[PDB]
PDB file of C-alpha atoms in Angstrom:
ATOM      1  CA  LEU A   3      -0.093  -0.033  -0.051  1.00  0.00           C
ATOM      2  CA  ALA A   4       2.924   2.416   0.626  1.00  0.00           C
ATOM      3  CA  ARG A   5       4.793   1.544  -2.718  1.00  0.00           C
ATOM      4  CA  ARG A   6       2.073   2.902  -4.980  1.00  0.00           C
ATOM      5  CA  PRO A   7       2.890   4.997  -7.325  1.00  0.00           C
ATOM      6  CA  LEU A   8       2.176   8.709  -6.491  1.00  0.00           C
ATOM      7  CA  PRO A   9      -1.175  10.411  -7.864  1.00  0.00           C
ATOM      8  CA  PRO A  10      -0.822  13.665  -9.884  1.00  0.00           C
ATOM      9  CA  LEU A  11      -1.510  16.825  -8.419  1.00  0.00           C
ATOM     10  CA  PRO A  12      -4.742  18.253  -8.161  1.00  0.00           C
TER      11      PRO A  12
ATOM     12  CA  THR B   4       6.080  13.426  13.091  1.00  0.00           C
ATOM     13  CA  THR B   5       3.215  16.114  11.718  1.00  0.00           C
ATOM     14  CA  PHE B   6       2.973  17.163   8.230  1.00  0.00           C
ATOM     15  CA  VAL B   7       0.464  19.791   6.398  1.00  0.00           C
ATOM     16  CA  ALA B   8      -1.548  19.298   3.335  1.00  0.00           C
ATOM     17  CA  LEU B   9      -0.507  21.122   0.419  1.00  0.00           C
ATOM     18  CA  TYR B  10      -3.503  20.592  -1.494  1.00  0.00           C
ATOM     19  CA  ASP B  11      -6.951  19.041  -0.956  1.00  0.00           C
ATOM     20  CA  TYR B  12      -7.357  15.068  -1.854  1.00  0.00           C
ATOM     21  CA  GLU B  13     -10.305  13.167  -1.917  1.00  0.00           C
ATOM     22  CA  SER B  14     -10.323   9.584  -1.529  1.00  0.00           C
ATOM     23  CA  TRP B  15     -13.328   6.814  -2.160  1.00  0.00           C
ATOM     24  CA  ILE B  16     -11.470   3.724  -0.974  1.00  0.00           C
ATOM     25  CA  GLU B  17     -11.249   2.691   2.673  1.00  0.00           C
ATOM     26  CA  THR B  18      -7.344   2.690   2.735  1.00  0.00           C
ATOM     27  CA  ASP B  19      -6.815   6.192   2.065  1.00  0.00           C
ATOM     28  CA  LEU B  20      -7.831   9.482   4.031  1.00  0.00           C
ATOM     29  CA  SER B  21      -9.425  12.695   2.402  1.00  0.00           C
ATOM     30  CA  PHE B  22      -7.967  15.651   3.616  1.00  0.00           C
ATOM     31  CA  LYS B  23      -8.296  19.460   2.917  1.00  0.00           C
ATOM     32  CA  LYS B  24      -5.387  21.592   2.346  1.00  0.00           C
ATOM     33  CA  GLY B  25      -3.852  22.842   5.455  1.00  0.00           C
ATOM     34  CA  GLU B  26      -5.027  19.956   7.204  1.00  0.00           C
ATOM     35  CA  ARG B  27      -2.386  18.422  10.055  1.00  0.00           C
ATOM     36  CA  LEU B  28      -1.664  14.783   9.767  1.00  0.00           C
ATOM     37  CA  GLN B  29       0.130  12.923  12.201  1.00  0.00           C
ATOM     38  CA  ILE B  30       2.216  10.101  10.225  1.00  0.00           C
ATOM     39  CA  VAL B  31       2.053   6.783  11.553  1.00  0.00           C
ATOM     40  CA  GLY B  36       7.357   4.525   0.916  1.00  0.00           C
ATOM     41  CA  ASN B  37       5.012   6.934  -1.492  1.00  0.00           C
ATOM     42  CA  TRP B  38       2.126   6.486   0.365  1.00  0.00           C
ATOM     43  CA  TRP B  39       2.225   7.169   4.360  1.00  0.00           C
ATOM     44  CA  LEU B  40       0.064   5.776   7.225  1.00  0.00           C
ATOM     45  CA  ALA B  41      -1.143   8.607   8.939  1.00  0.00           C
ATOM     46  CA  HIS B  42      -4.211   9.732  11.435  1.00  0.00           C
ATOM     47  CA  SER B  43      -6.361  12.795  11.101  1.00  0.00           C
ATOM     48  CA  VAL B  44      -7.605  14.129  14.691  1.00  0.00           C
ATOM     49  CA  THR B  45     -10.072  15.976  12.330  1.00  0.00           C
ATOM     50  CA  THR B  46     -11.825  13.147  11.368  1.00  0.00           C
ATOM     51  CA  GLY B  47     -10.627  10.246  13.534  1.00  0.00           C
ATOM     52  CA  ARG B  48      -9.599   8.300  10.804  1.00  0.00           C
ATOM     53  CA  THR B  49      -6.469   6.600  10.242  1.00  0.00           C
ATOM     54  CA  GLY B  50      -5.036   5.876   6.606  1.00  0.00           C
ATOM     55  CA  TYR B  51      -2.837   6.223   3.472  1.00  0.00           C
ATOM     56  CA  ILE B  52      -1.772   9.838   2.223  1.00  0.00           C
ATOM     57  CA  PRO B  53       0.024  10.469  -1.025  1.00  0.00           C
ATOM     58  CA  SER B  54       3.242  11.752   0.192  1.00  0.00           C
ATOM     59  CA  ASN B  55       3.496  14.637  -2.676  1.00  0.00           C
ATOM     60  CA  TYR B  56       0.185  16.230  -1.057  1.00  0.00           C
ATOM     61  CA  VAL B  57       2.186  17.301   2.314  1.00  0.00           C
ATOM     62  CA  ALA B  58       5.237  19.160   3.566  1.00  0.00           C
ATOM     63  CA  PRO B  59       6.928  19.243   7.011  1.00  0.00           C
ATOM     64  CA  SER B  60       4.718  21.393   9.872  1.00  0.00           C
TER      65      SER B  60
END
């Protein structure tokens, strides 16, 4: 769960 | 230990928190387990959405 890719900014 | 949200984030999955810009989050990889005293929830937040207090 911690190693998921970062989401884009708003 | 405590980080502040740089942007609003909305989550619909039970593992991740929703939070508002400026919310203080206590940190319990890319996603961090955090606790919100505002909502009482514990869940993951994306680390690129927060900055140190």
